[PDB]
Design a protein around this ligand. Structure first.
Ligand code: HEM
Ligand code: HEM
Ligand SMILES: Oc1ccc(I)cc1
Ligand SMILES: Oc1ccc(I)cc1
Lengths: 137, 137
């Protein structure tokens, strides 16, 4: 289930993080406008950029912590507040997060691993609801 | 064949019981709802809970007794009845049992080991038939 999925991702985090983030960017190419220097590059080009791996790993490090601190796929209010208040997230709306979790869930469903994709969908929705409660537009 | 598979499983009953049960919960995550104590725990956390190892082994011990008492993968009517009348199974249907056997068969096929998976599938089918006759919804 969900808790074991956290351990699974953590066991091979950089690989999962890059693959999920690439799934997100490829499904939603216009989301690249939030990032510098990602446009005009193939998956393999991005994976060789030193910033790409390091930053995607940091995102998913924190995403896994938020998932881990959750109860029944409900994140902590303080974790949601952190995500809203981060300067790097100042221009974002909940829709950006919805798209990320659509891509993540689709990746899990298409994978050869036994992810509890429904729980990740629930977590994504609960996170969006928490982001809204915390004041994200 | 089937008789040897019983010997293989019995030889390391705790490991097989835990592995097959987790394969079941992973393939059918909604089934975890029946095990309120296992909700939101990692596989490793589960393995450290006395009742997880104890009760899972006891489940598979009984499964092996039913298996061994069968003739050509046809279980005894009395064994089917035991499973239906158990208080712990009061809210279950034959669908819960088919799911378990689907996961068990997939586990066997995915292992490198020479399980008689076809026989286990047939045993599952025959047991489900016997459960319905014994009154299971
Ligand atoms: C639960 C989901 C998310 C988590 C846990 C998260 C977390 C983080 C973290 C920890 C960083 C710092 C990375 C670093 O400095 O190396 C970061 C940066 C950033 N994030 Fe988020 N983030 C999430 C979702 C999103 C989404 C959906 C977007 C936009 C579609 C986004 C846009 C950005 C941007 C533009 C930066 C700074 C630029 C960059 O790192 O390349 N984040 N995020
Ligand atoms: C042939 C298949 C099965 C056998 C032989 C079997 C046998 C057993 C046994 C011996 C116990 C008592 C364990 C103990 O208290 O130590 C038990 C309990 C229980 N079983 Fe079944 N079972 C089977 C299938 C299922 C299925 C498919 C479900 C539903 C997903 C289920 C749900 C439960 C629950 C909720 C308990 C109570 C918790 C526990 O004491 O383990 N069982 N079963
Ligand atoms: O650097 C990154 C990578 C992925 C995400 I989602 C946000 C920022
Ligand atoms: O305690 C348990 C474990 C596995 C099963 I299947 C039923 C009850």
């Amino acid at each position: 289930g969900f808790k074991q999925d956290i351990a699974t991702i953590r066991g091979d985090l950089r690989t999962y993080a890059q693959d999920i983030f690439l799934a997100f960017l490829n499904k939603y190419p216009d989301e690249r406008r939030y990032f510098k220097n990602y446009v005009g590059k193939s998956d393999q080009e991005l994976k060789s950029m030193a910033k790409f791996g390091d930053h995607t790993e940091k995102v998913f490090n924190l995403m896994m912590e938020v998932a881990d601190r959750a109860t029944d796929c409900v994140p902590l209010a303080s974790d949601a507040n952190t995500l809203v208040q981060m300067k790097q997230h100042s221009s974002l709306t909940t829709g950006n997060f919805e798209k990320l979790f659509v891509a993540l869930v689709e990746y899990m469903r298409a994978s050869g691993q036994s992810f509890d994709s429904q729980s990740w969908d629930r977590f994504g929705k609960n996170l969006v609801s928490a982001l809204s409660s915390a004041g994200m537009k």
